[PDB]
Amino acid sequence: KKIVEVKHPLVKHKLGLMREQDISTKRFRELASEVGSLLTYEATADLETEKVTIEGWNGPVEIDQIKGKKITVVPILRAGLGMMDGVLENVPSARISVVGMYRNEETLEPVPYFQKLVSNIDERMALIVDPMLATGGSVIATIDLLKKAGCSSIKVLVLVAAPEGIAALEKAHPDVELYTASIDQGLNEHGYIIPGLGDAGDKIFGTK
Amino acid sequence: KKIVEVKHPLVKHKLGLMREQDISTKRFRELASEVGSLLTYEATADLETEKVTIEGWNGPVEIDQIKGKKITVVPILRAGLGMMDGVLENVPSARISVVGMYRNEETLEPVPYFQKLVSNIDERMALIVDPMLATGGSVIATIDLLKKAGCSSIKVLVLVAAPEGIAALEKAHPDVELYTASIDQGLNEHGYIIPGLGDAGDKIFGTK
Amino acid sequence: KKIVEVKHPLVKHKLGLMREQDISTKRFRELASEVGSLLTYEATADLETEKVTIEGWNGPVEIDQIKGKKITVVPILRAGLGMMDGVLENVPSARISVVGMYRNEETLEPVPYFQKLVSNIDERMALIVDPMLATGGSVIATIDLLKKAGCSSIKVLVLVAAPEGIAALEKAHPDVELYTASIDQGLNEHGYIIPGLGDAGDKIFGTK
Amino acid sequence: KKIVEVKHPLVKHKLGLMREQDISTKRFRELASEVGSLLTYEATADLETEKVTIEGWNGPVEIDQIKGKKITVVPILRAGLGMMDGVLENVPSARISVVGMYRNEETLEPVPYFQKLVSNIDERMALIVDPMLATGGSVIATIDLLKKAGCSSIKVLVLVAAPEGIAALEKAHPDVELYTASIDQGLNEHGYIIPGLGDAGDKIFGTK
């Protein structure tokens, strides 16, 4: 149910640059992480904290610490690694739980091939990272895995989301929180988001 | 009159880590930027925008662009440089105006020694970045320089602030906006913020 | 045939930092990339160049450009990604051909579960990057994959290496270059490199 | 007397990109550090090591680490800061001793204005970093500074250097090592390196 289209000018601006078909795989990739950072700040605003004491240059000081077991960042392989740099900047001690998956372009169905989750995931907040949310198959498939491993409390970070994807996600896991940099118009006959920003995966890696 | 103490959980957490005695020049310097990045996001939430039509991956597309002349980051020399990496990760195109001055460890006042501002400051927003606001003599001294050079919209990003300094900054330039990561108890005999975080300048650079 | 063990003091130092059991994932991950950069510099020392004239700050000027199609970096999935940051800082436009295979002490002849190479792989140099070269199994397997695709210029970048692996690799693909930061004593009963540095994959990602 | 023009194809390639007139401050500032890192690698290849035994992941391990007092990096204020990022990446533990002095553009001679060096400078290796060595006035002037403070082993890292500056430096201090990415043709009427790369200070900071 909770959806957030971060409207911060810096996010709106940086996303703008990513849309130029002329951009380079290098700059494109970087921008992805910059936006990735901002979405992470916006999405971790509700982390619980706790007073602890340490020794400061002037004697014992009381400080705040995010409490609980380290959060886990879940990148959906290939596409997702492009935003990991920026996410990790805000949360460097996060445990990285990778999930490999790719979309069958004929059936538009997801095809999971690899999974490696941190342990005790039931005690952690999961942060799923992925460039797009087109049909929604990949994010939905990935949330099922996390929930199967026993994870509750999940937040999805996307750069651009298509209304269809959002709708499919809400039907499958209303208990999740969606933070996107933009909600586009919809999908074309091939499952690509429009306006959107092309094949994010290929662009980020420089493949075709 | 505008004073924002960013109480986001990642700021309190990274800030707490900076308080440790133990902390090395390397990690202290990173945390200075991390927190500095986050402080910018808050400080730059008001940026104005404009619509534009560029060539997208799938034809014409209207995007957002931050309007007007690039902003300028004004680091107060030495300590200030410690927070630039993070500030420029948000506004990489910003113009850097260095202003160097040190505090008279005796009289507790600012001693200017160098300044090189961008041109056309009239039409530019300025972000003064300095680690600590103790007496406020430094920030206030540099605001004076910028206002003399024609700048009208100024924002100050700080890690820790003493009420004494916030009180001084306010009665000197109330038309300024203060963004701090924490407001501390006050100054001690020799003018240092308590708890505060030591010689921010010395710790960033590793000098004695 | 061609084996290089970089003995630059900075490499030895950073690698030495990577051996403290107490180290953290964040720090270990960064260092894996710093060494990764230095290793990349040592392997691209023989890249071909070509003159080109452009518009310099003051009139035309002849410069040197790295001739040929862009090189492709090939990180072996999971661990390999931890050294990606460092490698890309040196070759920011390199195409990223990822290869993923599951490897255990039981996977004597690893098979990819996923892979996505760049096109015209036969007209490029390929830099395979993987933290540990224990039995050689994983790396020699991805060289077969690359050679079949048509690639005929391959360099391998590794953090630590066991004589076992180095020997196997040499027996399997002598026409390849091996750059390593350290050649350790050998392997133990369970397949780990000794001294080595433990399960590089798990430390880098923070899993188990 | 010892001069070293790094001829690495990656150093020539990154320097070439810097030659473009249309380049951006962000990109330009970024290449400065990239080349600066490589220069550091080249200049620190002769540092001494000392073995030490620490607790490894699987028990005792003998490691190598750099010997002696931590080195100090001396960026000549303003321009020099543009390369700091890269340098520090190879020696984060370094003590940053800054020195400010702008060149009198009528008398082409340095004008000192700030300095803050680390203690025991006479027991450390100095590392002076400044973008361009035109006439050699600034580097010679700051080496005077360091020698006066008792420093006796200095290395100068620069991106481009004019034969004039190299000659002046040698006459003045032949016991120093000079590392550069390019020895240009000479100085034009107004004392600017040719081809060179414009006014580094301005391009790096985005001023005028």
Side-chain angles (χ1 to χ4, degrees):
Chain A
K1 270 213 61 192
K2 189 185 181 182
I3 303 170
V4 179
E5 185 198 67
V6 182
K7 63 170 190 62
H8 195 105
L10 280 177
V11 163
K12 267 158 51 191
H13 179 282
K14 287 185 175 311
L15 184 67
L17 302 172
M18 281 190 250
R19 289 172 186 295
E20 289 177 293
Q21 47 75 197
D22 44 290
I23 201 172
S24 84
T25 282
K26 174 188 186 302
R27 184 55 178 154
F28 185 75
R29 190 163 60 224
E30 315 180 319
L31 288 163
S33 291
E34 297 191 69
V35 174
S37 304
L38 306 175
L39 262 45
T40 298
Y41 175 89
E42 189 66 51
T44 63
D46 71 333
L47 293 179
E48 203 162 306
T49 183
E50 66 183 354
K51 296 292 177 61
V52 168
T53 292
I54 63 170
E55 309 160 60
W57 64 279
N58 191 201
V61 182
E62 166 166 295
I63 64 171
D64 310 80
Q65 282 186 183
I66 295 164
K67 78 170 179 176
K69 283 188 165 301
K70 303 194 163 175
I71 88 176
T72 179
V73 175
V74 188
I76 303 175
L77 268 210
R78 269 261 292 170
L81 294 180
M83 306 171 64
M84 278 302 278
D85 188 301
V87 175
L88 293 178
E89 290 182 357
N90 296 296
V91 280
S93 303
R95 306 314 197 197
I96 305 169
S97 298
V98 300
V99 173
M101 204 173 263
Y102 74 78
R103 195 174 73 170
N104 171 41
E105 291 305 304
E106 286 278 24
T107 77
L108 260 52
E109 296 275 4
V111 187
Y113 53 76
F114 176 73
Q115 173 198 305
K116 222 306 182 187
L117 311 173
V118 73
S119 53
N120 302 314
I121 202 171
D122 194 7
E123 300 178 59
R124 317 171 182 282
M125 165 201 272
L127 225 201
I128 298 187
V129 180
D130 182 35
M132 327 280 256
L133 178 80
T135 67
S138 300
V139 162
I140 294 170
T142 178
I143 298 170
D144 295 315
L145 289 160
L146 295 184
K147 276 183 170 176
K148 224 155 285 276
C151 184
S152 51
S153 181
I154 307 173
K155 278 144 179 288
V156 187
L157 309 198
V158 190
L159 290 173
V160 290
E164 302 84 343
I166 296 180
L169 179 57
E170 183 151 49
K171 295 195 185 187
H173 307 102
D175 60 307
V176 152
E177 301 203 312
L178 205 227
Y179 295 80
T180 177
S182 147
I183 299 186
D184 292 313
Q185 310 184 203
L187 309 168
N188 66 343
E189 71 289 347
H190 296 148
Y192 281 93
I193 300 184
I194 78 185
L197 30 90
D199 202 65
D202 273 350
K203 226 295 171 288
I204 289 170
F205 287 74
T207 57
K208 286 303 172 180
Chain B
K1 190 179 175 190
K2 181 74 175 301
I3 306 172
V4 179
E5 173 174 3
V6 193
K7 46 67 176 183
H8 176 103
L10 258 48
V11 176
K12 292 175 186 170
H13 179 289
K14 292 178 190 293
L15 176 72
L17 298 168
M18 288 193 253
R19 309 268 196 183
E20 267 303 328
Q21 226 196 224
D22 309 18
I23 202 158
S24 65
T25 269
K26 177 181 177 302
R27 218 284 168 292
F28 186 84
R29 201 162 57 217
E30 294 167 34
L31 291 166
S33 286
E34 277 171 35
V35 174
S37 299
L38 307 189
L39 252 35
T40 312
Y41 184 84
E42 227 78 11
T44 62
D46 52 300
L47 296 182
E48 196 198 304
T49 293
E50 55 178 355
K51 294 288 193 172
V52 170
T53 291
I54 53 89
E55 192 64 15
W57 75 276
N58 200 73
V61 184
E62 168 176 287
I63 70 174
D64 291 303
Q65 278 184 189
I66 289 194
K67 188 175 190 176
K69 283 199 162 298
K70 302 196 181 316
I71 70 172
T72 176
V73 189
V74 190
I76 303 185
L77 270 201
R78 268 260 287 178
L81 294 175
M83 300 159 73
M84 287 297 274
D85 202 297
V87 173
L88 295 183
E89 272 229 353
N90 278 17
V91 287
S93 299
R95 303 317 184 196
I96 306 165
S97 302
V98 300
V99 164
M101 56 173 60
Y102 58 74
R103 189 171 72 168
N104 192 314
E105 26 225 335
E106 284 287 3
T107 77
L108 257 57
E109 291 191 56
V111 177
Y113 61 77
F114 177 91
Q115 79 162 63
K116 215 306 162 56
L117 323 175
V118 201
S119 52
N120 290 139
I121 239 58
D122 179 59
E123 324 152 59
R124 289 176 194 284
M125 195 255 275
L127 300 184
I128 303 183
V129 54
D130 188 46
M132 305 184 286
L133 184 64
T135 72
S138 304
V139 173
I140 292 177
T142 111
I143 286 176
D144 279 326
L145 293 170
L146 290 176
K147 280 185 172 182
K148 231 304 182 184
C151 192
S152 39
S153 66
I154 301 171
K155 289 156 189 279
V156 181
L157 300 183
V158 175
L159 297 179
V160 278
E164 304 68 4
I166 297 180
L169 168 58
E170 177 144 46
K171 73 161 300 173
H173 306 101
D175 58 312
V176 158
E177 302 205 318
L178 212 199
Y179 290 87
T180 176
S182 160
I183 297 169
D184 285 11
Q185 300 174 181
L187 316 180
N188 71 7
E189 317 79 63
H190 307 248
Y192 295 98
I193 300 185
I194 62 181
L197 41 85
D199 238 76
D202 282 346
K203 295 177 189 175
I204 290 176
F205 298 93
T207 61
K208 274 284 179 180
Chain C
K1 184 62 182 181
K2 210 284 242 302
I3 300 174
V4 174
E5 173 179 53
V6 178
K7 295 185 157 300
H8 188 105
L10 278 208
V11 180
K12 297 183 185 186
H13 182 272
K14 292 172 178 288
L15 186 63
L17 291 175
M18 293 195 261
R19 313 239 189 201
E20 40 194 57
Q21 60 172 177
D22 29 298
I23 194 163
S24 75
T25 290
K26 177 188 168 292
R27 234 319 200 188
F28 181 98
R29 197 164 62 214
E30 294 166 44
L31 279 166
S33 236
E34 300 189 305
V35 175
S37 299
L38 303 174
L39 235 39
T40 296
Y41 180 86
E42 224 73 299
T44 54
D46 55 290
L47 283 186
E48 190 180 312
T49 301
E50 68 184 353
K51 300 288 188 165
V52 164
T53 304
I54 65 173
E55 222 72 293
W57 78 281
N58 194 200
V61 54
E62 180 177 286
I63 69 175
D64 287 301
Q65 280 193 175
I66 289 180
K67 186 183 185 188
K69 284 192 147 290
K70 299 192 186 321
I71 69 177
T72 187
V73 180
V74 185
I76 294 176
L77 270 195
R78 267 266 300 199
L81 303 168
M83 307 173 78
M84 213 69 289
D85 277 357
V87 171
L88 291 174
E89 286 186 351
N90 286 305
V91 296
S93 301
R95 303 313 176 190
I96 308 170
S97 298
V98 330
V99 181
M101 33 186 54
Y102 191 79
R103 35 187 184 181
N104 271 34
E105 47 189 301
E106 8 197 61
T107 280
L108 303 186
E109 229 245 300
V111 192
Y113 49 63
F114 176 86
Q115 70 146 87
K116 208 302 156 67
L117 309 184
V118 291
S119 58
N120 317 298
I121 196 70
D122 38 285
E123 303 168 48
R124 309 166 180 280
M125 169 193 284
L127 308 190
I128 296 176
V129 37
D130 192 43
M132 322 286 263
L133 176 50
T135 68
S138 302
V139 159
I140 102 89
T142 134
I143 293 181
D144 291 321
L145 203 180
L146 288 174
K147 272 183 172 171
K148 182 179 175 183
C151 187
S152 55
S153 176
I154 310 172
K155 288 165 176 285
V156 175
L157 306 195
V158 151
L159 288 186
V160 318
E164 292 68 350
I166 291 180
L169 170 53
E170 180 152 47
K171 175 173 188 169
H173 309 119
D175 56 298
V176 157
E177 287 179 295
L178 202 213
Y179 297 73
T180 186
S182 165
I183 303 184
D184 286 14
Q185 310 174 187
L187 309 177
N188 71 15
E189 300 183 68
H190 306 74
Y192 290 69
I193 295 184
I194 54 182
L197 45 77
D199 186 341
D202 280 351
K203 284 203 182 184
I204 293 171
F205 289 71
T207 50
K208 284 296 187 174
Chain D
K1 189 185 184 187
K2 175 165 180 182
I3 301 174
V4 184
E5 176 177 47
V6 178
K7 249 69 181 297
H8 197 105
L10 231 34
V11 170
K12 293 165 149 188
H13 181 282
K14 291 179 179 298
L15 201 61
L17 297 176
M18 274 187 254
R19 301 286 188 190
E20 262 295 8
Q21 63 166 180
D22 43 87
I23 193 164
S24 83
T25 297
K26 186 284 178 62
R27 182 48 166 156
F28 182 101
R29 182 194 304 132
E30 168 178 344
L31 286 163
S33 295
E34 306 194 311
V35 185
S37 299
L38 304 183
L39 256 46
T40 308
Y41 183 80
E42 207 66 51
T44 60
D46 55 303
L47 293 180
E48 272 191 305
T49 273
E50 63 183 5
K51 300 265 173 46
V52 154
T53 293
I54 63 175
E55 246 294 316
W57 72 278
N58 180 244
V61 196
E62 176 165 292
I63 68 175
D64 288 284
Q65 70 168 49
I66 296 177
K67 199 183 68 170
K69 281 266 199 293
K70 280 168 174 49
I71 79 167
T72 174
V73 176
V74 191
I76 303 185
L77 217 274
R78 270 270 293 193
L81 291 174
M83 299 163 79
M84 279 304 280
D85 256 46
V87 177
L88 285 170
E89 311 325 59
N90 281 299
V91 287
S93 58
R95 300 312 173 204
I96 306 166
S97 301
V98 316
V99 175
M101 49 179 42
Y102 57 74
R103 188 177 68 174
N104 179 308
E105 260 9 10
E106 288 283 358
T107 63
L108 265 44
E109 215 161 61
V111 175
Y113 65 72
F114 182 91
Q115 83 165 68
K116 210 300 199 297
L117 320 173
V118 299
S119 47
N120 311 135
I121 187 62
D122 51 58
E123 301 161 56
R124 309 163 192 281
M125 177 200 285
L127 225 189
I128 302 176
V129 28
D130 191 36
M132 308 182 291
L133 180 70
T135 65
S138 301
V139 164
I140 292 167
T142 92
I143 293 180
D144 287 340
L145 275 162
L146 297 178
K147 282 186 177 175
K148 200 181 117 145
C151 183
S152 57
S153 64
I154 304 151
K155 291 166 170 278
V156 181
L157 308 183
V158 305
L159 296 169
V160 295
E164 292 78 337
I166 298 190
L169 174 61
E170 177 156 50
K171 311 247 294 70
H173 305 286
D175 53 300
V176 156
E177 289 170 290
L178 195 247
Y179 297 81
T180 184
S182 175
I183 302 189
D184 284 49
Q185 292 153 185
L187 298 173
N188 73 12
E189 319 86 70
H190 312 268
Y192 288 65
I193 300 160
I194 281 192
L197 38 77
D199 194 67
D202 287 346
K203 292 209 174 194
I204 300 177
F205 289 79
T207 56
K208 287 296 180 174

